[PDB]
Assembly symmetry: C3
Homo-oligomer: 114 residues x 3
């Protein structure tokens, strides 16, 4: 799985250990081993949510399977929780796009996961 967070929160406000926390919690949530989880945090961004620039985040979760209505509600609670607690971003200023990737459409290690 791959989780990306783009945010206007400054780098210095991203706590130590955050990428590891994301990795850990995503492995748990998706059921996939942490060796397969990749995470990417992009702070200091020029962004607005609903016309204003209070802390916000635009995020993506890509996974080969483990994507669906109930699962994605659960992921959203988890991820909005983490962004609120660690980055002080209000959950109503977070969007997360979920993508169910086909294995043949994910490259890794000179080939694909198919």
């Amino acid at each position: 799985p791959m989780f990306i967070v783009n945010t206007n929160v400054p780098r210095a406000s991203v706590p130590d250990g955050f990428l590891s926390e994301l990795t850990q919690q995503l492995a748990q949530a998706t059921g996939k081993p942490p060796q397969y989880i990749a995470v990417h945090v992009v702070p200091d961004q020029l962004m607005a949510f609903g016309g204003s620039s209070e802390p916000c985040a635009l995020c993506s979760l890509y996974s080969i399977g483990k994507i669906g209505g109930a699962q994605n509600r659960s992921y959203s609670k988890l991820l909005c929780g983490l962004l609120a607690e660690r980055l002080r971003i209000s959950p109503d200023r977070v969007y997360i796009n979920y993508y169910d990737m086909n294995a043949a459409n994910v490259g890794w290690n000179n080939s694909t996961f198919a």
Copy 2:
């Protein structure tokens, strides 16, 4: 809706008010309230278009519905217009990927839009 612009134009060349203008014009174009529009501009990027590092932009527009053939032509005229006028980017050096997202695949506020 979420609109992202990645560009090699420098930050200083992005006018004050550009995020607000995008918000307003996208609200009008999509018919969605401004409160639901998120915008993200990423200047100073290392990018090329057709092998050239002249000004260019790679963009994405995500929306739950309000995406389709005619609509995306209209959005492209609008947004290339804005990028030409405000950032001095030629329309033929802009790509915009359009995504019609399923509500269940968009997280927000600890749940999804489904």
Copy 3:
């Protein structure tokens, strides 16, 4: 086509001529004219792959067609090869998301490709 590479490798480690090499090799691999190939490299990122901050890359290849099982295997061998040779990233620390875009969902030059 549009190819994006996000990496924790520093900017100074991205060799001169890299965006051109990508453009050229992607034109050849996809069969598309180089004029339609866009490339975007984002170094110095805060990211982890399998919990680790050793060099890694999270990438995307978008194309209108020319996406499929065998084609994507071949792209992955090409692209992982270039990331290894030029950026010294191990192929097993690269993910590449492949996207077959509908022409009606790609804006360019005030319109779409449909």
